[PDB]
Amino acid sequence: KTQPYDVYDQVEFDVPIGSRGDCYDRYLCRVEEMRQSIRIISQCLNKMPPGEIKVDDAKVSPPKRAEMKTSMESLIHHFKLYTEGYQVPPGATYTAIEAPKGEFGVY
Amino acid sequence: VHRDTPENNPETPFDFTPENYKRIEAIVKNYPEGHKAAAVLPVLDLAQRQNGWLPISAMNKVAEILQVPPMRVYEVATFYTMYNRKPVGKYHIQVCTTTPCMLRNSDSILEAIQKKLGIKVGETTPDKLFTLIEVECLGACVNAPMVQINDNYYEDLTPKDIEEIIDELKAGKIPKPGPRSGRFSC
Amino acid sequence: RPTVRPRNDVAHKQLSAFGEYVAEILPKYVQQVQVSCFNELEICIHPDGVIPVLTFLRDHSNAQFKSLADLTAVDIPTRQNRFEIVYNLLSLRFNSRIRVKTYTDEL
Amino acid sequence: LIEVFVDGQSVMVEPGTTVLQACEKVGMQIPRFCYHERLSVAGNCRMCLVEIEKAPKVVAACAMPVMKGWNILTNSEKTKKAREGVMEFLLANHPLDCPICDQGGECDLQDQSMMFGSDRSRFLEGKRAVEDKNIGPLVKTIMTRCIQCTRCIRFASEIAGVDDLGTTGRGNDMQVGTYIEKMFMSELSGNIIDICPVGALTXXXXXXXXXXXXXXXXXXXXXXXXXXXXXXXXXXXXXXXXXXXXXXXXXXXXXXXXXXXX
Amino acid sequence: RFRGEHALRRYPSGEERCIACKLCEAVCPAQAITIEAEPRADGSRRTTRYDIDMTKCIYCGFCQEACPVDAIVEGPNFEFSTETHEELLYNKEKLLNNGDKWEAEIAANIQADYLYR
Amino acid sequence: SLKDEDRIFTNLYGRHDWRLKGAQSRGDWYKTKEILLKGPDWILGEVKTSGLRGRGGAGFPTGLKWSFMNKPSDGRPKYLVVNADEGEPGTCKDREIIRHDPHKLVEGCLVGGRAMGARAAYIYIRGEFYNEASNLQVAIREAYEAGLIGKNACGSGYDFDVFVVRGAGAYICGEETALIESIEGKQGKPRLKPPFPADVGVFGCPTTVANVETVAVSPTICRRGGAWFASFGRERNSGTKLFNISGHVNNPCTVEEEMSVPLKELIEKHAGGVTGGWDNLLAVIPGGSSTPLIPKSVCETVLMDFDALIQAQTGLGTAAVIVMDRSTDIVKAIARLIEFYKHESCGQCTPCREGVDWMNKVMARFVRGDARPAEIDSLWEISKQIEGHTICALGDGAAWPVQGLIRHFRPELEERMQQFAQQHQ
Amino acid sequence: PTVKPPTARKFIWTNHKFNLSGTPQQYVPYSTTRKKIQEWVP
Ligand SMILES: Cc1cc2nc3c(=O)[nH]c(=O)nc-3n(C[C@H](O)[C@H](O)[C@H](O)COP(=O)(O)O)c2cc1C
Ligand code: SF4
Ligand code: SF4
Ligand code: SF4
Ligand code: SF4
Ligand code: SF4
Ligand code: FES
Ligand code: FES
């Protein structure tokens, strides 16, 4: 609810919060997460705009297989996005997306 | 073909002009005295006029007279369009097909010439008399059709007049400038 | 830009206020360098006092962080001072992420 | 010496210094195809186009000198629109050899598309192919992969001595070959394969043996032929196969010996 | 589309489809694939050393994706059980070329792969 | 303020009867001794005071270009350069300035010899026009032997020798940098224009490039008064230039006309096809090959002067009419103009060798109708790009007419694509 | 064998083979390179 990752707040979420810090109430919320998770999956099925699958800019994601065989720049970028990496901008960044266990604080 | 050169029966045998050798030396003196590569551009035009169809070995002999690089002098004639590449007949004519001529019909003059003098468009005569080739521009665009044969360019011709001039050229020269109307203003 | 840009800067000036507020105290003992880029704040701290910096942000009237959760360290042999211990801090009441770094060689 | 600011930062340069030569002092490398180290200054590509502070037309870095105190930006709006465009023109008539091509990562044109050129799409339909030029022992030359520039053309005329490479046509048919069927002389012309940016001229002895990716490089002076120093040798597991000339200030003029290259 | 045991495909009129690039070598996150290339007799230049370790390889389909010629195509495979590591790790093509028994399925599966799904 | 057409005034009038002595009676070398006795500074000032624009397809003033060299101190001896060969198609100036009156062209080199300060003068003629080149060579034999130019002639200290050289017939006569490289002996390719022009270094000498019509106007401007040349035309651009009409016309003829003249009046005098601008659809181009085709709506307001022509679409530089009728195809005609540049591309700058050849291949598809409706807008971005990032002016010359397809037109191009989309697909 | 036919290329094996296992005629590793040559002769 606080930090959106990829199209959030638009999808309706329900977060189970108990009262006692015991093992039973910490188990009940996990089952209450499971019953209030299909709401998101159903809303994912409701909202699906048809379009691009990868980023159209070919400096990040490799182009289509039918595209690379004919056009020139596509295959050279295919040759350099593989073997060689991405050529990333320098800087330290920290991201955390909600794991069902906790967090994945990639730094 | 522009880059590739044949090695069979047109690579070793070459002849240079002996009577025009004194005239070719005088042409080199017209430019700068020290460091003269300008003669190579002039001798290449003189070689085609004296001998029909320039040989690959003949260009090397012409480069030796001016004392220049053999590869550089061979490349100098490759960029030029006026110089002969493979083979030319007794009277070779080039037809103009550019937009200033195509606006008042230029393709009709070429199609009528193709049927009268035989062959398609690129192929020359088997008996070697007339060779046809597509040209960019003849130079003088005052007349609606333009065709340059050997040296003198013939301008202004009808559908039947072009065929009559071509058949007459087989035995006697037809001269001519713009045989359809006044030269300057009409 | 539609697919090229991730997010436009709007909270960048709001987060820059923290870059002034802590720096308004102005300790040579604590502050030194304040870096702010891509909706995130980075502070490096003089080796002599690290505990007084960590007691700050904990509680505090203006900003309540409390959770000094994730803790990383950087190995880099370019500088004369080798290691760089990096603290990743998160607020629940305030909803913000701030960074605490150490500059010393710490052998 | 006259000083002129490039990208706001001021840098002192000589009166007869080039625009790209002035850019090196500010620690910025412009996109190149026609050399600046030892080969003579020539245009015939227009890749290194840079826009001045107040100019209607962009000037080439190889030809145009700084002269007067004028501001020139490397990361300008006009320059980025130029660099993406010229790359598309270079690749409209390019044979597509990248996986088969002898170079791959070492190719200068391969990097410039990734760094400067347009990524998303390239508008092209139907590319012309050139016939294979004759070559002797070293460098298995392919005329199709060649971009038709002036780098190896001037190398044979100035650096090597014996001239062979030049022009053959006019449009998109002009080949960089010798035109007459003759093998290239030895002397010091074995270093011509290392000079070319594209994967057109590459050593036949060590062709397709190892790519630029996954090869450990080490600098060592050559034993064969005297006064030879700084030559990078790629390990690429167990036995070394490719040896390239390393840059030296006084010992060697960025060219390996023909006996040492093979 | 399912990834199992590796097998390299070929053209309908003979000829090995693998062109030798070292492309799939560098992408490989396990570094299971090794490639050393030499010219084939005269003219053609297609492979000599081609070993894929099954002691390594975490199965990505990255080598399937990085390949411009579509040589390594991952076939529906489950059956692989050996007595030694030596019997398990794949030799210089050969056993990979012996994937002809699965290449009939691969040709059917790739028809559902061009213009993805 | 309004300009009248000719009215017993011409730079070159003799075309019917001229050889060597016949031209002399009808105004030729009248003040040959007077111009030679005058100083180099005073003779150069006469061209600057008149304000004559450049006859060649560039737009640069002739007064500023001749004064650009000046020569304060010279180590290497200076040489004079002149271009006479046909560059852009639709021009008749090549076979009129030298072919009809060869004595006037030879006098132009002598008038600019003492002014610029050149040891020798050189002229370049077209390889295809051999008959016109023979007339120029015959005039040199009648001038050097008799005593017109060379060593010491007409009471002059400065020596000038005229020599004519046959050209290849391509872009070598086109660009100003190309003429220096072609005359030197090297392959037909222009030198780098940004660092050094003709004045700094051309064939190992300080030189100046001049057009066939521009050089011929110099003795006429020197002999007659300075106000006479500036009388006809506009304030910015003044001087009579030879305009030739070719294509769809009742009678195709080249005639000398005054500057700042309307297009409707010039076409009516020479007589065009069907109508001047009422029945037949207007597709006439102000330039020979450089400038794009003018619209049907704006044609009467357009003037012959370069300063007035720049206000609407593009300026006229070559000054040649290329009129096309309503019955004649528009798409196929402009595609042939680009095909001219496909053959006349030299082979240096990469957005031209692999540029124009790429441009012609897309343009050939529009005649057939296989091209997509989206491809029209994409081609406009490429066409604009070639104009800026090229060494020589021929890169611009191929860029401008393609821009005239997207502008003014567009439903004409869309109709060709829509016709093949329903019939074939 | 009913609707979708298998494609013929004359490269695929006509007779189907069983698993390698611990039994004879099984999988094996093999060397590839010709190595660095060294020779001495009288
Ligand atoms: C495609 C093209 C062709 C040209 N052809 C010629 C030519 O044949 N002769 C010429 O004198 N100028 C020609 N020019 C004009 C040149 O730019 C010329 O060298 C010079 O800049 C004009 O100055 P001038 O009038 O003093 O010669 C041509 C320009 C272009 C764009
Ligand atoms: S020359 Fe460079 S970009 Fe072109 S195919 Fe070869 S490696 Fe790729
Ligand atoms: S072979 Fe290489 S150096 Fe030579 S012209 Fe072609 S691209 Fe330039
Ligand atoms: S499997 Fe594909 S990417 Fe790997 S070497 Fe063979 S052809 Fe190249
Ligand atoms: S599936 Fe992954 S780990 Fe296995 S060979 Fe391919 S790239 Fe390497
Ligand atoms: S623009 Fe074209 S014709 Fe002009 S110099 Fe460049 S490549 Fe040659
Ligand atoms: S355009 Fe045909 S003669 Fe010039
Ligand atoms: S890189 Fe400067 S002109 Fe080619």
UniProtKB/Swiss-Prot annotation, chain A:
Positions annotated to bind [4Fe-4S] cluster: 23, 29, 44
Location relative to the cell: Mitochondrion inner membrane
Family: Belongs to the complex I 49 kDa subunit family.
Described purpose of this protein according to its UniProt entry: Core subunit of the mitochondrial membrane respiratory chain NADH dehydrogenase (Complex I) which catalyzes electron transfer from NADH through the respiratory chain, using ubiquinone as an electron acceptor. Essential for the catalytic activity and assembly of complex I. Redox-sensitive, critical component of the oxygen-sensing pathway in the pulmonary vasculature which plays a key role in acute pulmonary oxygen-sensing and hypoxic pulmonary vasoconstriction. Plays an important role in carotid body sensing of hypoxia.
The protein's assembly and partners: Core subunit of respiratory chain NADH dehydrogenase (Complex I) which is composed of 45 different subunits. Component of the iron-sulfur (IP) fragment of the enzyme. Interacts with NDUFAF3. Interacts with NDUFAF7. Interacts with CERS2.
Protein name, as recorded: NADH dehydrogenase [ubiquinone] iron-sulfur protein 2, mitochondrial
Lineage: Eukaryota, Metazoa, Chordata, Craniata, Vertebrata
Gene: NDUFS2
Parent-record interval covered: 304 to 410 of 463
Swiss-Prot record, chain B:
First-level EC class: translocase
Membrane topology annotation: Peripheral membrane protein
Keyword Transmembrane appears in the UniProt entry: no
Enzyme Commission number(s) from the entry: 7.1.1.2
Free-text cofactor note: Binds 1 [2Fe-2S] cluster.
Binding residues annotated for [2Fe-2S] cluster, in chain numbering: 96, 101, 137, 141
Entry cofactors: [2Fe-2S] cluster
Any Gene Ontology biological process: mitochondrial electron transport, NADH to ubiquinone
Keywords, sorted A to Z: 2Fe-2S, Acetylation, Electron transport, Iron, Iron-sulfur, Membrane, Metal-binding, Mitochondrion, Mitochondrion inner membrane, NAD, Oxidoreductase, Phosphoprotein, Respiratory chain, Transit peptide, Translocase, Transport, Ubiquinone
Record-listed Phosphotyrosine modification sites: 154
Catalytic reactions of this protein: a ubiquinone + NADH + 5 H(+)(in) = a ubiquinol + NAD(+) + 4 H(+)(out)
Entry GO MF terms: 2 iron, 2 sulfur cluster binding; metal ion binding; NADH dehydrogenase (ubiquinone) activity
GO cellular component: a single term: mitochondrial inner membrane
Subunit: Core subunit of respiratory chain NADH dehydrogenase (Complex I) which is composed of 45 different subunits. This is a component of the flavoprotein-sulfur (FP) fragment of the enzyme.
Family of the protein in this entry: Belongs to the complex I 24 kDa subunit family.
The protein, known as: NADH dehydrogenase [ubiquinone] flavoprotein 2, mitochondrial
Organism: Bos taurus (Bovine)
Name of the coding gene: NDUFV2
Residue range from the parent sequence: 40 to 225 of 249
From Swiss-Prot, chain C:
Organism annotation: Bos taurus
Key word RNA-binding present: no
Subcellular locations according to the entry: Mitochondrion inner membrane
Keywords attached to this entry: Electron transport, Membrane, Mitochondrion, Mitochondrion inner membrane, NAD, Oxidoreductase, Respiratory chain, Transit peptide, Translocase, Transport, Ubiquinone
UniProt GO cellular component terms: mitochondrial inner membrane; mitochondrial membrane; respiratory chain complex I
Protein's name according to its UniProt entry: NADH dehydrogenase [ubiquinone] iron-sulfur protein 3, mitochondrial
Coiled coil region boundaries: none
Source lineage: Eukaryota, Metazoa, Chordata, Craniata, Vertebrata
Complex formation: Core subunit of respiratory chain NADH dehydrogenase (Complex I) which is composed of 45 different subunits. Interacts with NDUFAF3. Interacts with RAB5IF. Found in subcomplexes containing subunits NDUFS2, MT-ND1 and NDUFA13.
Task of the protein: Core subunit of the mitochondrial membrane respiratory chain NADH dehydrogenase (Complex I) which catalyzes electron transfer from NADH through the respiratory chain, using ubiquinone as an electron acceptor. Essential for the catalytic activity and assembly of complex I.
BP GO annotations: mitochondrial electron transport, NADH to ubiquinone; mitochondrial respiratory chain complex I assembly; reactive oxygen species metabolic process
Family stated for the protein in its record: Belongs to the complex I 30 kDa subunit family.
Gene Ontology molecular function: any one: NADH dehydrogenase activity
This protein's record includes keyword tRNA-binding: no
Transmembrane segments: none
UniProtKB/Swiss-Prot annotation, chain D:
Binding site for [4Fe-4S] cluster 1: 94, 98, 101, 107
Domain 4Fe-4S His(Cys)3-ligated-type, residue spans: 78-117
Positions of modified residues (N6-acetyllysine): 54
Domain of life: Eukaryota
Binding site for [4Fe-4S] cluster 2: 146, 149, 152, 196
Residues reported in the UniProt entry to bind [2Fe-2S] cluster: 34, 45, 48, 62
The 2Fe-2S ferredoxin-type domain, residue ranges: 1-78
Signal peptide start-end: none
Locations listed in the record: Mitochondrion inner membrane
Function (record text): Core subunit of the mitochondrial membrane respiratory chain NADH dehydrogenase (Complex I) which catalyzes electron transfer from NADH through the respiratory chain, using ubiquinone as an electron acceptor. Essential for catalysing the entry and efficient transfer of electrons within complex I. Plays a key role in the assembly and stability of complex I and participates in the association of complex I with ubiquinol-cytochrome reductase complex (Complex III) to form supercomplexes.
Family: Belongs to the complex I 75 kDa subunit family.
Assembly information from the UniProt record: Core subunit of respiratory chain NADH dehydrogenase (Complex I) which is composed of 45 different subunits. This is the largest subunit of complex I and it is a component of the iron-sulfur (IP) fragment of the enzyme. Complex I associates with ubiquinol-cytochrome reductase complex (Complex III) to form supercomplexes. Interacts with MDM2 and AKAP1.
Protein name stated in the entry: NADH-ubiquinone oxidoreductase 75 kDa subunit, mitochondrial
Organism of origin: Bos taurus (Bovine)
